[PDB]
Scaffold this motif. Sequence first.
Motif, PDB file in Angstrom:
ATOM      1  N   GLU A 129       0.875  -0.944  -0.195  1.00 20.42           N
ATOM      2  CA  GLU A 129       0.225  -0.175  -0.153  1.00 20.42           C
ATOM      3  C   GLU A 129       0.840   1.276   0.116  1.00 20.42           C
ATOM      4  O   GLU A 129       2.014   1.234   0.512  1.00 20.42           O
ATOM      5  CB  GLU A 129      -0.793  -0.174   1.318  1.00 20.42           C
ATOM      6  CG  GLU A 129      -2.192   0.836   1.252  1.00 20.42           C
ATOM      7  CD  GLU A 129      -3.164   0.297   2.191  1.00 20.42           C
ATOM      8  OE1 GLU A 129      -2.635  -0.447   3.247  1.00 20.42           O
ATOM      9  OE2 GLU A 129      -4.323   0.522   1.756  1.00 20.42           O
ATOM     10  N   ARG A 137       0.922   5.829   0.061  1.00 19.93           N
ATOM     11  CA  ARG A 137       0.169   6.950   0.049  1.00 19.93           C
ATOM     12  C   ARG A 137       0.638   8.149  -1.189  1.00 19.93           C
ATOM     13  O   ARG A 137       1.743   8.515  -0.740  1.00 19.93           O
ATOM     14  CB  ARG A 137      -0.018   7.723   1.250  1.00 19.93           C
ATOM     15  CG  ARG A 137      -0.719   9.041   1.294  1.00 19.93           C
ATOM     16  CD  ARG A 137      -1.125   9.559   2.924  1.00 19.93           C
ATOM     17  NE  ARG A 137      -1.676   8.614   3.494  1.00 19.93           N
ATOM     18  CZ  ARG A 137      -3.242   8.716   3.586  1.00 19.93           C
ATOM     19  NH1 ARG A 137      -3.819   9.274   2.842  1.00 19.93           N
ATOM     20  NH2 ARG A 137      -3.588   7.813   4.260  1.00 19.93           N
ATOM     21  N   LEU A 152       0.396   7.839  -5.763  1.00 20.48           N
ATOM     22  CA  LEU A 152       0.381   6.613  -6.976  1.00 20.48           C
ATOM     23  C   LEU A 152       2.040   6.349  -7.591  1.00 20.48           C
ATOM     24  O   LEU A 152       2.017   5.468  -8.187  1.00 20.48           O
ATOM     25  CB  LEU A 152      -0.503   7.224  -7.870  1.00 20.48           C
ATOM     26  CG  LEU A 152      -0.668   6.384  -9.226  1.00 20.48           C
ATOM     27  CD1 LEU A 152      -0.959   4.948  -8.807  1.00 20.48           C
ATOM     28  CD2 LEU A 152      -1.898   6.707  -9.928  1.00 20.48           C
ATOM     29  N   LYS A 204      -5.927  -1.035  -6.353  1.00 15.31           N
ATOM     30  CA  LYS A 204      -7.049  -0.494  -5.773  1.00 15.31           C
ATOM     31  C   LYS A 204      -6.882   0.822  -5.238  1.00 15.31           C
ATOM     32  O   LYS A 204      -5.896   0.575  -4.189  1.00 15.31           O
ATOM     33  CB  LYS A 204      -7.926  -1.595  -5.250  1.00 15.31           C
ATOM     34  CG  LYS A 204      -9.298  -1.356  -4.893  1.00 15.31           C
ATOM     35  CD  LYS A 204     -10.284  -1.517  -6.012  1.00 15.31           C
ATOM     36  CE  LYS A 204     -11.424  -0.900  -5.637  1.00 15.31           C
ATOM     37  NZ  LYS A 204     -11.347   0.256  -4.824  1.00 15.31           N
ATOM     38  N   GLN A 205      -7.632   1.658  -5.418  1.00 17.56           N
ATOM     39  CA  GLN A 205      -7.497   2.865  -4.529  1.00 17.56           C
ATOM     40  C   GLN A 205      -9.034   2.847  -3.663  1.00 17.56           C
ATOM     41  O   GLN A 205      -9.726   2.525  -4.085  1.00 17.56           O
ATOM     42  CB  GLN A 205      -6.997   3.925  -5.173  1.00 17.56           C
ATOM     43  CG  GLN A 205      -8.287   4.515  -6.361  1.00 17.56           C
ATOM     44  CD  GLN A 205      -7.714   5.038  -7.566  1.00 17.56           C
ATOM     45  OE1 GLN A 205      -8.382   5.028  -8.671  1.00 17.56           O
ATOM     46  NE2 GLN A 205      -6.342   5.302  -7.476  1.00 17.56           N
ATOM     47  N   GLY A 225      -6.238   9.078  -0.762  1.00 14.82           N
ATOM     48  CA  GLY A 225      -4.833   9.015  -1.548  1.00 14.82           C
ATOM     49  C   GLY A 225      -4.237   7.537  -1.350  1.00 14.82           C
ATOM     50  O   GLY A 225      -3.028   7.428  -1.579  1.00 14.82           O
ATOM     51  N   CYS A 270      -3.562   3.634  -2.051  1.00 15.57           N
ATOM     52  CA  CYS A 270      -3.581   2.922  -3.237  1.00 15.57           C
ATOM     53  C   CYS A 270      -2.540   1.537  -2.970  1.00 15.57           C
ATOM     54  O   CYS A 270      -1.748   1.459  -2.393  1.00 15.57           O
ATOM     55  CB  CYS A 270      -3.184   3.377  -4.562  1.00 15.57           C
ATOM     56  SG  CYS A 270      -2.311   4.824  -4.638  1.00 15.57           S
ATOM     57  N   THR A 271      -3.301   0.437  -3.714  1.00 12.71           N
ATOM     58  CA  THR A 271      -2.827  -0.979  -3.459  1.00 12.71           C
ATOM     59  C   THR A 271      -2.449  -1.623  -4.487  1.00 12.71           C
ATOM     60  O   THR A 271      -3.166  -1.707  -5.294  1.00 12.71           O
ATOM     61  CB  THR A 271      -3.551  -1.625  -2.279  1.00 12.71           C
ATOM     62  OG1 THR A 271      -3.884  -0.776  -1.110  1.00 12.71           O
ATOM     63  CG2 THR A 271      -3.154  -2.849  -2.008  1.00 12.71           C
ATOM     64  N   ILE A 290      -6.348   9.808  -7.200  1.00 12.76           N
ATOM     65  CA  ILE A 290      -6.519   8.834  -6.305  1.00 12.76           C
ATOM     66  C   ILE A 290      -7.315   9.453  -4.854  1.00 12.76           C
ATOM     67  O   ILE A 290      -7.140   8.888  -3.765  1.00 12.76           O
ATOM     68  CB  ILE A 290      -5.158   8.316  -5.895  1.00 12.76           C
ATOM     69  CG1 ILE A 290      -4.225   7.735  -7.013  1.00 12.76           C
ATOM     70  CG2 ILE A 290      -5.769   7.026  -5.048  1.00 12.76           C
ATOM     71  CD1 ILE A 290      -4.995   6.921  -7.810  1.00 12.76           C
ATOM     72  N   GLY A 337     -10.216   6.612   3.212  1.00 12.44           N
ATOM     73  CA  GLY A 337      -9.563   5.315   3.355  1.00 12.44           C
ATOM     74  C   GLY A 337     -10.129   4.352   4.185  1.00 12.44           C
ATOM     75  O   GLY A 337      -9.285   3.430   4.290  1.00 12.44           O
TER      76      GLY A 337
END
Lengths: 96, 96, 96, 96, 96, 96
Positions: free
Chosen positions: A7, A9, A11, A33-34, A38, A40-41, B35, D38
Amino acid sequence: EALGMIETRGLVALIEASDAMVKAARVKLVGVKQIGGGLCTAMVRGDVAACKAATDAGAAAAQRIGELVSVHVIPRPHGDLEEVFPIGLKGDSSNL
Amino acid sequence: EALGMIETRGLVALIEASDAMVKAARVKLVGVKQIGGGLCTAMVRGDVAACKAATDAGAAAAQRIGELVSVHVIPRPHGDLEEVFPIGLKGDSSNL
Amino acid sequence: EALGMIETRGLVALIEASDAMVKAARVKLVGVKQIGGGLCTAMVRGDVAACKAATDAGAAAAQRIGELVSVHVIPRPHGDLEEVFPIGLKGDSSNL
Amino acid sequence: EALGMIETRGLVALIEASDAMVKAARVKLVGVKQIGGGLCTAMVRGDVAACKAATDAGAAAAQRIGELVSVHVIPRPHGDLEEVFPIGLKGDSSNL
Amino acid sequence: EALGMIETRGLVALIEASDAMVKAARVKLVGVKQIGGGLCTAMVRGDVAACKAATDAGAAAAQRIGELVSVHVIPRPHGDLEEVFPIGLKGDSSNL
Amino acid sequence: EALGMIETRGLVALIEASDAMVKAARVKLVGVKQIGGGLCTAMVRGDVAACKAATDAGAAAAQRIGELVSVHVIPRPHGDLEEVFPIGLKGDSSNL
């Protein structure tokens, strides 16, 4: 196949972390996936050894340029996970 | 082709950073992704030299008017990246 | 045509800023984009002079009622920008 | 069937919490929902005992790697809940 | 027709503010838009007098139960606004 | 029919609050809406008495496990509200 996940924080950390994972081991990037805020994973699949090399390569890179939120390998993910999350050997998902 | 990326907090920094990248080198703007949290990212492709000129031009401009989150070039991005992120020489993506 | 842009935190500042831009100069409102965090952005096109009058009219109004994030004119935006952002003389975009 | 739910801040806590729930009891992962900021939530269904074992297994794991927002079992959820939330024994939902 | 708008942080303030606007004057609720961060906005159209009564009724109510972000009337909105924002006498928009 | 609404920060508070509303009175859960920031809202319809029992039951439960943002009953919501918000006796909405 095992599952690795990173994950970040931001992109650009996450794209770099992914390129790292995938270059460092026989793992396959299967989705990303977000969740807002902010966060995203990225998810990868491969052999348990690979997903440890992968995610360890990917964590390094993330931290050099971004902000890692978390790194983790699940060696034997329940098949139930593939129904609900973008972690699946065949474009099965995470588009709704 | 290499990959360059700029993250900004705010979309007008990012549009200006992009116009800068693209005017300053033979790179091509291939996609842009937000995001949440107000984070947004532009990606360019071109020769490694170009993506360094690009992203260096784009960073300058971003910082004059916005808030750069990060700048970075990956010289030889894994083909696996084009499956999952809007970094791809042919409108392949980032619409779901 | 040049490009003018206004970012606001809050949508009523931004709608008012837009009405201002468009009443104050021969510019055309071409699209508007939010990026989460409550950030939203309007884009206008017209002559370089107009986009300076516009965005200067629009900034005034935004600040009276909201919170301007940023104002900016790019006199000669790269055609590459029209592919990726809602800044384009023909409903070409920003719907995915 | 009862309903168990786990909220996490971060998606890798939540995927791990889910794998835990599902391995620890006869419960079924039925859907997952993010709400921005989140925040993300997983739901499981099964026997009341299972959903207590599940969510108790899943909470453990979440807290080891993430940030649990909340854990909770509703033994006998109103059928009205299945109309509006992704908690339903048949892919009925949470895609709009 | 004039345009009135109310922004709230929280959706129940905003639904109550809207019911107030619409009960207090001959204005018509034409659309509502969220921009993340929990910000949401309602728009009404009617006579200039009405939109002042409306938005003044709606502000009252919002503040009793929520958090008003902003209130404002634009007496003569540019027709260009109806292209880009959900402020339009005929379900023309704000669905993409 | 009257309208009751509960806002929560976190989705498990909100699902529990809803199960509570609906078990405690003859009200019907008609929709639920998130606005980012992790804010989410449930709406119920029924008799004015019911919506007071409902929302009072639902508030209790929310506060035991989450963070209530707000609770409120509008006895006689304008028909105009059903056009724009997911508060409507027939799956009319809140999917775009």
